[PDB]
Amino acid sequence: TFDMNRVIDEFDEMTRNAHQVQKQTLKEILLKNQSAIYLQNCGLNGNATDPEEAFKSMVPLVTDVELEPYIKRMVDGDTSPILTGHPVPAISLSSGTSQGRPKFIPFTDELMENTLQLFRTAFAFRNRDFPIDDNGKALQFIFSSKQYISTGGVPVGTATTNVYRNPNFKAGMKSITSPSCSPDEVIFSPDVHQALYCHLLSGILFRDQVQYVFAVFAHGLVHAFRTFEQVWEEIVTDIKDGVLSNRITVPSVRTAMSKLLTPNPELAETIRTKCMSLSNWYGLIPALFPNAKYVYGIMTGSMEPYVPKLRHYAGDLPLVSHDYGSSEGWIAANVTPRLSPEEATFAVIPNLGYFEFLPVSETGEGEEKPVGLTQVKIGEEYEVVITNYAGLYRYRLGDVVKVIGFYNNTPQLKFICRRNLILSINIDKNTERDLQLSVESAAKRLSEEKIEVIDFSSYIDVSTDPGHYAIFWEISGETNEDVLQDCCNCLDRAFIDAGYVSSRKCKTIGALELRVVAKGTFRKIQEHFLGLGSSAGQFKMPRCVKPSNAKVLQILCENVVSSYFSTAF
Amino acid sequence: LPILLDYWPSMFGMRARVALREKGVEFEYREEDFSNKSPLLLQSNPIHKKIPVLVHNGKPVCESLNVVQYVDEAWPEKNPFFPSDPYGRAQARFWADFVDKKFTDAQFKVWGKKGEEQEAGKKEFIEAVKILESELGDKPYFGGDSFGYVDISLITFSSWFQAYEKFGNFSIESESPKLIAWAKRCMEKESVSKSLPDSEKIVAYAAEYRKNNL
Amino acid sequence: LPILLDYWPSMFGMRARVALREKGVEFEYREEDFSNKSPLLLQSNPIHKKIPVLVHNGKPVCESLNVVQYVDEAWPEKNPFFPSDPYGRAQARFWADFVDKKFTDAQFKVWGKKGEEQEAGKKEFIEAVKILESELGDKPYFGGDSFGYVDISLITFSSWFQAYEKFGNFSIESESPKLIAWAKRCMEKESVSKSLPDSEKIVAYAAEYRKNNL
Numbered sequence: 003t004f005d006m007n008r009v010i011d012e013f014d015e016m017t018r019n020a021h022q023v024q025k026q027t028l029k030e031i032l033l034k035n036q037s038a039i040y041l042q043n044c045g046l047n048g049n050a051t052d053p054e055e056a057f058k059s060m061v062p063l064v065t066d067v068e069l070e071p072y073i074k075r076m077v078d079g080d081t082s083p084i085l086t087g088h089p090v091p092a093i094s095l096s097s098g099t100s101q102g103r104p105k106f107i108p109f110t111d112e113l114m115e116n117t118l119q120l121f122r123t124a125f126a127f128r129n130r131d132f133p134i135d136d137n138g139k140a141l142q143f144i145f146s147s148k149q150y151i152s153t154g155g156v157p158v159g160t161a162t163t164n165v166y167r168n169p170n171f172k173a174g175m176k177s178i179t180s181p182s183c184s185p186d187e188v189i190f191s192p193d194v195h196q197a198l199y200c201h202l203l204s205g206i207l208f209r210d211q212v213q214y215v216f217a218v219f220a221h222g223l224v225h226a227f228r229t230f231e232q233v234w235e236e237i238v239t240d241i242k243d244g245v246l247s248n249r250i251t252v253p254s255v256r257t258a259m260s261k262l263l264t265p266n267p268e269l270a271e272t273i274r275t276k277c278m279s280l281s282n283w284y285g286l287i288p289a290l291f292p293n294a295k296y297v298y299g300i301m302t303g304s305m306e307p308y309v310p311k312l313r314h315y316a317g318d319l320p321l322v323s324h325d326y327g328s329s330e331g332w333i334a335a336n337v338t339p340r341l342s343p344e345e346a347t348f349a350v351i352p353n354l355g356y357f358e359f360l361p362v363s364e365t366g367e368g369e370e371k372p373v374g375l376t377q378v379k380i381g382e383e384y385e386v387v388i389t390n391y392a393g394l395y396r397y398r399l400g401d402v403v404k405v406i407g408f409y410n411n412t413p414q415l416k417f418i419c420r421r422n423l424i425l426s427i428n429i430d431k432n433t434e435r436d437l438q439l440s441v442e443s444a445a446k447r448l449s450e451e452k453i454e455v456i457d458f459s460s461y462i463d464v465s466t467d468p469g470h471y472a473i474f475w476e477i478s479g480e481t482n483e484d485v486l487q488d489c490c491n492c493l494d495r496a497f498i499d500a501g502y503v504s505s506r507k508c509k510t511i512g513a514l515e516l517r518v519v520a521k522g523t524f525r526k527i528q529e530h531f532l533g534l535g536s537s538a539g540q541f542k543m544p545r546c547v548k549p550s551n552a553k554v555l556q557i558l559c560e561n562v563v564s565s566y567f568s569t570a571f
Numbered sequence: 572l573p574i575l576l577d578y579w580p581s582m583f584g585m586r587a588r589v590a591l592r593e594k595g596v597e598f599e600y601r602e603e604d605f606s607n608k609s610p611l612l613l614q615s616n617p618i619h620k621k622i623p624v625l626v627h628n629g630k631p632v633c634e635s636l637n638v639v640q641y642v643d644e645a646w647p648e649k650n651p652f653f654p655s656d657p658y659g660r661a662q663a664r665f666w667a668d669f670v671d672k673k674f675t676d677a678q679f680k681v682w683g684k685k686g687e688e689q690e691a692g693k694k695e696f697i698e699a700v701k702i703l704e705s706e707l708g709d710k711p712y713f714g715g716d717s718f719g720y721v722d723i724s725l726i727t728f729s730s731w732f733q734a735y736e737k738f739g740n741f742s743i744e745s746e747s748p749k750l751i752a753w754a755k756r757c758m759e760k761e762s763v764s765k766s767l768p769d770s771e772k773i774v775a776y777a778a779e780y781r782k783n784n785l
Numbered sequence: 786l787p788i789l790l791d792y793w794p795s796m797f798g799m800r801a802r803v804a805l806r807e808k809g810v811e812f813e814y815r816e817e818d819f820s821n822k823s824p825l826l827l828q829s830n831p832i833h834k835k836i837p838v839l840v841h842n843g844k845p846v847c848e849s850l851n852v853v854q855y856v857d858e859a860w861p862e863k864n865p866f867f868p869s870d871p872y873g874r875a876q877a878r879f880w881a882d883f884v885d886k887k888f889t890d891a892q893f894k895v896w897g898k899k900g901e902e903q904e905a906g907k908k909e910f911i912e913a914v915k916i917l918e919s920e921l922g923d924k925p926y927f928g929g930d931s932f933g934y935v936d937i938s939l940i941t942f943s944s945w946f947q948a949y950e951k952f953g954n955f956s957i958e959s960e961s962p963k964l965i966a967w968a969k970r971c972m973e974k975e976s977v978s979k980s981l982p983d984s985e986k987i988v989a990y991a992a993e994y995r996k997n998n999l
């Protein structure tokens with residue numbers, strides 16, 4: 003049960019207990035999982051009285067390539083347990099690549115627990131700094147409308163979908179958020195670009211009680227608002243006649259929205275008046291719900307360029323930087339949210355995992371060995387290595403972060419990070435160029451509609467005979483299928499290489515499937531990633547999914563706003 | 572500086588713009604109000620009064636396919652649309668003539684007329700896109716091993732494909748896919764990717780045309 | 786030897802014959818029965834099944850004007866049909882398009898029709914011959930300093946001049962002596978003195994056509 007003072011006190015006690023709870027986090031992870039086969043090869047059994055020392059002297063650091071076959075083993079019909087343990091209820095993907103290729107990680111109910119608490123805690127310190135009305139609401143551009151099922155019959159998933167469609171999500175978040183404007187089915191609408199418009203419209207619906215505007219990211223926010231600049235007159239029309247735009251085709255959201263609609267002409271006079279009154283839409287956000295106390299989102303790292311466009315939108319409204327973690331392990335809360343984005347820092351919550359740091363202090367890089375978290379050095383930058391319930395045990399995520407200070411005894415983290423970048427050579431390609439060129443070729447049938455392609459992805463399905471390619475697309479508007487069908491053909495026609503030519507012309511690799519997905523999917527991916535625990539080197543999204551990639555994958559299937567197999571061929 | 576007399580939905584004006592931009596000319600476009608055909612246009616073709624019209628050396632160059640061969644011959648050093656043999660040239664010209672007859676009239680029928688006229692036009696264009704699909708066979712383009720003469724000739728019809736799909740209430744793609752398929756392939760050329768206006772608008776122009784004449 | 790599929794009263798087929806003969810190319814003449822089209826006509830043109838069609842190097846070329854350009858491009862060594870410049874080949878193409886359509890449509894209403902279509906047709910033909918006389922400015926030929934492209938395009942309508950003189954009841958010569966006599970110059974050439982059948986035969990033929998279809 004969420005309250006302000008007790009949780010912050012316990013959080014104070016806890017951050018001050020940083021060593022014990024960290025050490026205990028280690029013990030707990032391993033108590034739960036003394037059985038890991040990874041660990042068998044390492045010599046573990048638990049207990050003893052040199053545990054921490056034994057773990058750190060006996061267990062080698064690991065990369066995405068090496069963790070790939072094992073969680074892959076878990077996901078594909080070998081429903082089996084491995085690097086963590088339990089076949090997990092879901093699996094993630096990780097930005098940057100595993101040699102150009104897919105990265106799999108386990109999701110457990112622990113990951114849901116950390117989730118509520120960090121936000122339990124987060125909202126508490128922020129509402130400590132930005133107190134909300136206990137009867138108002140929030141404009142949250144959040145989505146987890148999609149849920150794919152892996153080929154072994156096992157769920158593999160995003161942080162969003164798995165949290166939002168989690169059984170404990172609704173009851174758990176009931177007390178620590180202002181109630182969502184959107185009915186869950188539209189949030190979970192098989193069409194989230196249309197649902198996004200419905201979301202624009204939903205948060206817009208209860209503005210006067212609305213206490214914050216939220217996206218995980220500033221870029222998410224700005225995406226919403228440039229779109230706002232595009233569609234406000236249409237929204238006026240839709241909401242006005244009590245009849246929704248012909249833009250909207252999926253019946254359950256249409257069903258829910260008709261439940262929301264009756265004809266109301268006066269207010270249009272209002273919105274039109276205010277909206278045309280602005281100077282280049284500056285300060286749009288306080289214009290919509292003028293008593294929102296904040297704009298909330300991740301403001302650091304590769305999102306720093308999106309803080310300003312958003313600031314333009316935010317006007318003089320304060321920007322509060324969001325905390326930092328993902329399914330791969332939670333890292334740190336901002337408990338002083340009143341701090342500006344440029345100075346925003348996030349302090350580590352210690353039972354979320356057992357975390358260690360490799361110093362770059364020598365040159366670049368530096369053959370120094372990992373030292374503890376309160377053993378880390380102020381002002382210096384270290385790489386995060388993660389041990390938690392997410393499949394990570396002493397795992398190199400590949401990201402560099404800086405110590406600005408300590409809140410009591412737990413250290414304060416800063417990100418000036420962006421790409422976790424080096425790469426290696428692939429096989430979800432059909433080169434980066436070939437795939438990218440491909441979307442380019444196909445997307446211009448859409449360009450004819452005054453729309454540009456925002457983002458794209460892909461996938462190898464080998465449950466099917468023959469197996470098939472799935473191309474995923476993020477565009478700026480609803481359209482017809484015919485052009486999208488057309489597009490899929492071009493995705494196929496853009497793969498200029500002779501090889502692909504052999505199979506699909508013969509047909510021993512099946513017709514590519516274009517499953518068009520809805521707005522914000524790749525936004526779901528960026529938002530989950532930069533927030534992901536390590537250091538904002540977290541944004542080069544892998545472009546085609548081998549069976550071993552997941553975070554994009556849960557998000558794969560359910561918002562097929564349409565999905566097709568080439569009627570050519 | 573080449574002056575082009577053009578019309579936003581002219582598939583033919585588009586033949587001109589695509590041709591020129593395919594080559595390497597920087598040129599100016601002037602939009603026509605065919606209710607008020609220009610002093611320079613009425614001097615370019617005082618009887619047809621039709622576009623596209625490219626003006627070079629103060630010499631009016633008229634008719635779309637005429638204008639694109641003009642494109643070839645006015646800058647003969649970089650991007651040829653024909654191949655080297657005379658027979659290949661006659662094949663490409665052959666097929667450009669193909670683009671211009673039963674193909675153009677049939678689309679004219681599918682978005683311009685209805686009923687007894689419509690289905691005639693509908694089976695005509697499916698037939699056309701089928702002989703088309705047959706001769707495309709495999710080639711990335713049409714008139715050479717690269718972006719060709721008639722590539723320019725028939726690519727420009729692929730923004731009206733939306734128009735045809737809707738009033739026809741068809742889908743010209745499950746009957747002959749490699750065609751539209753080749754089209755969004757040809758859209759990657761900066762020659763057509765900046766010369767051709769939006770198809771919802773093109774759709775809407777045929778909608779205006781239809782609403783006028785029912 | 787190149788193989789021409791043709792039709793003896795066809796003006797367009799005469800255009801082809803004219804081109805090869807103006808050159809010096811030795812070719813074999815073939816008459817097609819549209820009632821009983823030969824295997825090669827069917828195997829060269831699966832779609833239009835129309836004449837003329839020349840088989841050369843085992844590759845088929847169809848349409849008369851295509852042919853002529855095919856003939857110029859394959860034999861560019863002795864008597865060139867087009868000017869060297871882009872802009873003159875331009876005008877020639879422009880004017881080759883003019884006689885093939887409006888002049889051929891108008892003429893089509895003259896010999897093949899009755900009543901109002903024939904009267905309006907008469908007006909169209911004399912206006913069009915008036916324009917041809919005007920563009921000609923007053924040139925001896927059309928397409929180059931010697932016998933040219935659009936001369937070749939138009940000259941085969943001179944074998945039908947007589948049929949237009951009879952059915953349209955007009956003298957294209959008292960109104961434009963320059964075009965008929967443009968033809969009567971060009972008639973001194975074996976390309977026209979051996980390609981265009983007697984105008985008597987075309988007159989009896991077209992009159993026969995008007996007997997067959999009502």
Ligand SMILES: N[C@@H](CCC(=O)N[C@@H](CS)C(=O)NCC(=O)O)C(=O)O
Binds near residue numbers: 581623636671
């Ligand atoms: N084959 C011609 C067709 C051109 C044509 O018919 N253009 C029409 C546009 S539909 C035009 O300019 N009409 C003049 C007018 O509408 O007054 C070309 O490619 O230029």
Ligand SMILES: N[C@@H](CCC(=O)N[C@@H](CS)C(=O)NCC(=O)O)C(=O)O
Binds near residue numbers: 796798836849850
């Ligand atoms: N573009 C062709 C079309 C000509 C055309 O229709 N020619 C007549 C010969 S006089 C023809 O072949 N008609 C075929 C038929 O009667 O079905 C050309 O100019 O040669």
Ligand SMILES: CC/C=C\C[C@H]1C(=O)CC[C@@H]1CC(=O)O
Binds near residue numbers: 116117119218325
């Ligand atoms: C523990 C937080 C779980 C919910 C987190 C998600 C949000 O609702 C904002 C982003 C955040 C992800 C992040 O902090 O990395």
Ligand SMILES: CC(C)C[C@H](N)C(=O)O
Binds near residue numbers: 218526529
């Ligand atoms: C945990 C979620 C609510 C948000 C998370 N950053 C994601 O996009 O997956």
